[PDB]
Amino acid sequence: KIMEIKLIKGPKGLGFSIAGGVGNQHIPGDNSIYVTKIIEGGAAHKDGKLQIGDKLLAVNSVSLEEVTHEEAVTALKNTSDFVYLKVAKPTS
């Protein structure tokens, strides 16, 4: 299940933590970026769509598939104010 989440970047960012990445696998065999924590009162929390365990596909034009952890952190920190976050809700 793929969805697009609309977020306004707050002073402290998008308001979630990530794990994963090429060379830093969160799930054995998977390079994907995963949401690990939703920050209380942050943009992602207030929107209510994003959940722990969701896979990030893209942040605006930037793919987060088959990227390093540092690449995804950079991407998420340096987005514009208005963010279209594409995510995949896990099945298992």
UniProtKB/Swiss-Prot annotation:
Residues 4-90 form the PDZ domain. Transmembrane segments: none annotated. The modification Phosphotyrosine is found at Y84. Induction: By BDNF. Phosphorylated by MAPK12. It is found in: Cell membrane; Basolateral cell membrane; Endoplasmic reticulum membrane; Postsynaptic density. It comes from the Eukaryota. Widely expressed. Strongly expressed in epithelial cells, in the small intestine it is only detected in the vili. Expressed in brain, heart (at protein level), muscle, lung and liver. In the brain it was detected in olfactory bulbs, cerebral cortex, hippocampus, and spinal cord (at protein level). Essential multidomain scaffolding protein required for normal development. Recruits channels, receptors and signaling molecules to discrete plasma membrane domains in polarized cells. Promotes epithelial cell layer barrier function via maintaining cell-cell adhesion. May play a role in adherens junction assembly, signal transduction, cell proliferation, synaptogenesis and lymphocyte activation. Regulates the excitability of cardiac myocytes by modulating the functional expression of Kv4 channels. Functional regulator of Kv1.5 channel. The PDZ domains may also mediate association to membranes by binding to EPB41 and ADGRA2 together with the L27 domain that binds CASK and DLG2. This is Disks large homolog 1. It comes from Rattus norvegicus. The lineage of its organism: Eukaryota, Metazoa, Chordata, Craniata, Vertebrata. The chain holds residues 315 to 406 of 911 of the full protein.
